[PDB]
Structure formats: structure tokens, C-alpha cells
């Protein structure tokens with residue numbers, strides 16, 4: 001009924017974000033939404049009550065998961081999957097202002113940003129999710145499963161660490177270093193919500209991945225990011 | 232290293248590698264494939280890790296673009312349809328409408344983040360884990376069937392609309408896109424984890440059959 005009422009009379013402009021109070025992927029969208037200056041309203045779906053089952057929500061996101069975004073200005077267009085939401089946001093911002101904030105007007109750069117974005121959504125987040133699952137929520141304890149996924153997460157963080165280290169090495173020839181085109185992009189921001197969750201699986205970023213540490217801290221100090229995470 | 236064309240790094244049994252070959256074929260781009268033997272650990276060679284810092288396949292080199300390196304199947308697919316549309320003005324396997332593109336990307340990220348990884352884990356605990364654990368296998372097999380349930384339902388609704396009947400149905404804009412092709416290589420392997428598409432998901436069966444009959448797809452595979 002709660003969510004049902006919302007779809008009774010939807011806003012005419014702005015954005016509505018469906019998420020969950022402890023969903024890193026939700027904050028990933030909130031962050032980009034905030035950085036781009038997009039005004040939005042967040043609805044925290046109560047999965048316990050099965051609000052994600054509400055025919056109204058499944059219609060927004062057939063996968064029945066969060067986040068899902070409704071672009072009211074575009075006839076209530078619904079975009080699901082955090083990766084697709086980010087691309088929708090930077091593409092829209094760019095065509096509206098002519099300024100590719102957190103993005104790039106260059107095909108070559110966009111493909112590099114996409115590579116990191118797909119790497120994050122497909123190789124980073126899913127793995128952190130599996131490690132958390134076997135470490136805390138599986139029907140039985142499986143040490144071999146925990147080790148498999150925890151190792152993979154450290155491995156992917158090593159890929160990020162190495163890339164950041166190489167970017168620094170190139171400049172030297174504490175200054176902020178970024179993954180693509182020496183500028184902050186959604187490729188960097190996408191990791192932020194999760195870099196804060198990996199401690200739960202025994203990973204200490206500050207000590208284990210120095211470069212990732214500086215990188216994440218630079219982003220955590222940005223107003224738009226602080227505002228989004230406080231939401 | 233060529234001046235034009237594309238060089239695709241993949242593996243003989245890598246569904247993600249074939250996903251790229253398929254799109255490269257359909258779009259008419261000329262490419263040559265370099266198969267890596269994870270035996271010798273060719274994917275751990277400095278020169279390859281320079282192409283893909285993740286040391287995984289696929290990885291694509293766009294020679295015409297100063298040997299630009301692109302890794303992650305999803306990013307590779309977006310690069311190809313973007314480049315093709317820019318060159319021809321025809322959004323083959325894509326769309327020139329912002330709304331449509333967001334839907335294509337939705338399904339694309341869904342396939343790469345919730346489909347391929349889950350099938351991958353089902354296969355691992357089923358065939359290659361150091362220990363045999365049914366609950367691990369069930370967890371992923373159940374998730375894969377749930378994912379197909381989402382596709383099946385989407386295709387059924389699209390079918391329902393067409394009715395208001397032997398015609399192909401697609402995920403976005405009543406036309407074949409990278410959203411559809413992205414599933415092809417993986418649909419062909421789920422039988423290894425006990426999923427019978429023909430029986431369990433009728434619409435997916437037809438959908439994958441229409442795709443599997445395309446000449447460009449046959450050639451690539």
C-alpha cells in the first residue's frame with residue numbers, strides 16, 4: 001500500500017530512488033545523483049514486508065532488487081542496475097549541459113571508464129557479496145567458500161591498487177590520482193560505497209592497499225559524497 | 232601489430248570471449264582472435280596484463296584507435312555499438328534513443344553482473360571446488376533459475392504485446408540488441424548445471440534459438 005500509493009500519483013519532475021538503508025549499490029547511485037546536482041527522493045524498500053514484491057516495484061525493476069531509479073522528467077522512465085543508472089545520469093547531464101562531469105566526451109576515455117565500471121559491478125561487488133554471504137549468512141559454515149571469495153576480493157583490490165600506483169608513477173615523472181584521464185569519474189566513485197564494507201570480511205584497506213586508501217579518502221571528503229552517504 | 236581492425240584475446244571455452252566475437256561478427260568488424268592457454272599462464276604475461284589489468288579474457292585491441300585496449304565484455308560491447316553507430320549513422324544492435332539505451336544497459340549489466348557470475352559459481356562448486364557441498368551448488372543453481380525467470384517473464388510480456396504468431400521477440404525496442412546477444416553464449420552452458428531451457432523456460436528457448444540461427448552468430452561460435 002505504501003509503495004502502491006506512490007505509484008498512484010507520481011512526481012512530474014526530478015528523480016525517485018528506490019534503495020535500502022544498507023545497500024552499497026544504492027549509495028553508489030545517490031553519490032552520482034548528488035555529485036551531478038540532480039534533485040531526488042529516496043524510498044527505502046522494506047524487504048522484510050516484501051515491498052520489493054509489490055507489483056508496482058517489479059514493474060520498475062523486473063529483477064526485484066535495488067537500486068532502481070525513476071526519471072520522472074522522461075515519462076517516468078525506469079532504469080535498474082546501478083551500472084546502467086550511472087551511465088544514464090552522466091549521459092543525461094552531458095547532453096543537457098555540454099559538460100561531461102564525471103564522464104568524458106571522448107569515446108576512448110568512455111571505454112576506459114566503462115571497463116572499470118563493469119569491473120566494479122561484475123567483478124568487485126558480486127564477490128564482496130559472496131564473501132559476506134558465506135562468512136555470515138549461509139545455512140552452514142564453509143571455510144573453503146569464505147577463503148575463495150575473500151581471496152578474490154583482495155585480488156581485485158590489488159588490480160585497483162596497481163593501476164593507481166602506475167598512475168602515480170607516471171606523474172612523478174600525495175597528489176590525487178584517478179583511474180581515467182587524470183580526473184574524477186564515475187569509475188572512481190563506483191567503488192566508494194563498497195570500500196567501506198570490506199572491513200567486514202577482514203580486509204584492512206588502509207594497511208593492505210595504501211593507494212586505494214588515499215583515493216577513497218579524497219572522494220570521502222567531497223561535499224556531494226558526504227551528503228549522499230548521510231542521506 | 233596491425234594498423235586497422237581488431238585483435239580479440241579470448242579462450243576456447245570462454246563464453247564471455249564468444250560474446251565479443253558475436254557482436255564483432257554481427258557488426259561486420261574485421262578481427263582476428265588470439266586464444267590464450269591459461270595453462271602456461273599467458274594471461275599473466277606483462278604484455279597482456281598491460282591490455283587488461285584484471286588479467287582476464289576477453290580483452291580487445293582497437294588498432295584504428297591507436298591500439299586502444301578495452302577489457303570487460305560489457306565495456307567492449309558498448310564500445311563496438313557506439314563506434315558502429317558513429318561511423319554509419321545506423322544504431323545496429325543498439326539504439327539512438329536515450330531511453331532505449333538505458334534499457335539496453337540495464338539488461339547488459341544484469342547479464343554481466345547477475346547472470347554470468349552466478350552460472351560461473353554454480354559451475355565451480357559443481358565441478359571444481361576442493362570440496363563437494365550441495366548447499367553451495369543449490370544456492371547458485373537456484374539463483375540462475377531465478378535470473379532466467381526474470382528473462383522468461385520479460386519475453387512473455389513482449390510476446391503478449393505482439394499478440395495484440397511465429398515471430399522473434401526481443402528484450403528492448405522490438406529489435407535485436409547487445410542486450411539479447413549477451414546471454415547467448417551462457418544460455419548454451421547452463422545444461423551443465425542441470426537447467427533445461429527448452430523445458431523450464433519456453434520463451435527463452437525460442438529467443439536463444441532465433442539468435443543461434445543467425446549466420447553471424449554461427450560463424451563466430
Ligand SMILES: N[C@@H](CCC(=O)N[C@@H](CS)C(=O)NCC(=O)O)C(=O)O
Pocket residue numbers: 020022023024025026047064065066067080081082083121340344345
Ligand atoms: N548488480 C546489481 C546488484 C543489485 C543488488 O544485489 N542489490 C542488493 C542491495 S546492494 C539488494 O537488492 N538486496 C536485497 C536482496 O537481494 O533481496 C546493481 O549493481 O544494481
Ligand SMILES: N[C@@H](CCC(=O)N[C@@H](CS)C(=O)NCC(=O)O)C(=O)O
Pocket residue numbers: 118122123242244245246247248269286287288289302303304305343
Ligand atoms: N566480468 C568479466 C568476466 C571475465 C572472466 O572471468 N573471464 C573468464 C572467461 S569467460 C576468464 O578469463 N577466465 C580465466 C580465469 O578466471 O583464470 C567480463 O564480462 O569480461
